[PDB]
């Protein structure tokens, strides 16, 4: 699977870690169900088929479930010497994993519902970042679902841009960048007209989308030693860069 003799002008490698943080949260604020799906891509561009030993903080705790690419061999006469493999050239999916314990939620989102009879409906939603203040959360979207009978909505947001979509029955609140341990808020006033009075509105949850540059499992790459017998070069010779990208997945609240 790493066929013939590889040849490149300078031997470097790139690691991509991709995690999707799924979450349902109660209106009061209770972590009731949540997992992180994860996957590690390696884009190694190196000369001559080498051996690699890859390491990470499993058992600084955390790791439920996992699977490897067929190149990996976990056993050589019993036990494991971490992940140990003979990588293909270029881009390939090394491993895929799940984790539930020590959960690290990037955002906490907090609703405030307050009805005036059956005519008006007051809304205030606040979001907080829960990661390093030095780091760079992008592509933030917060979707607040409006009722099916909605005359008109009034919206203002302290940071970002927000708009009520008639068709999609939701206020869409977009923020282009947000850093850690900071706060922002949206407040909305929704007008109504009551017809049937018993189909009690099964309140859909508030959804969030975000890209973050950290792994919301708590997983981080410890090392990856590269060894090559045939040729001369080894692990100090290779330039190694690692990237964490936290895809949203399903990130609900107010349920």
């Amino acid at each position: 699977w790493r066929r013939e003799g590889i040849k490149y002008r300078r031997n470097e490698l790139f690691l991509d870690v991709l995690e999707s943080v799924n979450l349902l949260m109660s209106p009061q604020g209770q972590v009731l169900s949540a997992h992180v799906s994860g996957r590690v891509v390696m884009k190694s561009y190196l000369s001559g088929m080498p051996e690699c030993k890859f390491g990470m903080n499993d058992k600084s705790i955390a790791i439920d479930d996992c699977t490897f690419h067929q190149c990996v061999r976990l056993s050589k006469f019993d036990s494991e010497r971490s992940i140990s493999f003979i990588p293909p050239d270029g881009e390939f999916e090394l491993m895929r994993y799940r984790t539930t314990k020590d959960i690290i939620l990037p955002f906490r989102v907090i609703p405030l519902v307050r009805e005036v009879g059956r005519t008006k409906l007051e809304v205030k939603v606040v979001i907080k970042s829960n990661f390093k203040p030095s780091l760079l959360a992008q592509k933030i979207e917060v979707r607040i679902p409006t009722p099916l009978n909605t005359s008109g909505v009034q919206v203002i947001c302290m940071k970002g841009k927000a708009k009520y979509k008639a068709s999609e029955n939701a206020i869409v609140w977009k923020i282009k960048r947000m850093a850690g341990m900071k706060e922002s808020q949206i407040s909305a006033e929704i007008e109504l007209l009551p017809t049937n009075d018993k189909k009690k509105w099964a309140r859909p949850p508030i959804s969030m989308n975000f890209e973050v540059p950290f792994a919301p499992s708590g997983l981080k790459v410890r090392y990856l030693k590269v060894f090559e017998p045939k040729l001369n070069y080894s692990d100090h010779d290779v330039i190694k860069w690692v990237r964490y990208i936290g895809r949203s997945g399903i990130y609900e609240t107010r349920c």
């Binding site: 690691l15 760079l136 540059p213 790459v221 090392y223 990856l224 190694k240 860069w241």
Partner: peptide
């Protein structure tokens, strides 16, 4: 984003 690895 890209940080360098020991």
């Amino acid at each position: 984003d890209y940080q360098r690895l020991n």
